[PDB]
């Protein structure tokens, strides 16, 4: 596999449908996904629902998902209110929120 071996399924997101009617016990909904060739419709189980959720996904987005572990990855390349304002001298606002240091990338 390209990196790993997990089965994975990222892009842009193009249509979110998530149910509002299933009962708290198994959620799901269906993506739509830009891939790197065409935008695919992916169905999504409760943990996705929980991922995308969490990850705070909304259309125009982009993420991954891991068939796996049923974990949600928002990627980095379709994003929404990312700071590029990195002149913080009088914006005491340091909120870089530990989020998962994965690899001591470090600035």
Same mark, same amino acid.
């Given at each position: 596999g390209p990196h790993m +071996?997990?089965?994975?399924?990222?892009? +842009?997101?193009?249509?979110?449908?998530?149910?509002?009617?299933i009962?708290?016990?198994? *959620?799901?909904? *269906?993506? /739509?996904?830009?891939?790197?060739?065409?935008? /695919?419709i992916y169905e999504l189980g409760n943990k996705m629902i929980d991922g995308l959720t969490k990850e705070k996904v909304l259309a125009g987005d982009v993420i991954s998902i891991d068939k796996?572990?049923? *974990?949600?990855? *928002?990627?980095?390349?379709?994003?929404?209110?990312?700071r590029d304002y990195d002149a913080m001298g009088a914006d005491t606002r340091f909120v870089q929120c530990p989020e998962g240091e994965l690899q001591k990338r470090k600035t």
């Open positions: +071996e997990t089965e994975l399924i990222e892009g +842009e997101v193009v249509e979110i449908q998530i149910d509002r009617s009962t708290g016990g198994h *959620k799901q909904g *269906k993506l /739509t996904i830009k891939t790197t060739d065409m935008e /695919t796996a572990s049923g *974990k949600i990855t *928002k990627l980095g390349r379709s994003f929404a209110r990312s």
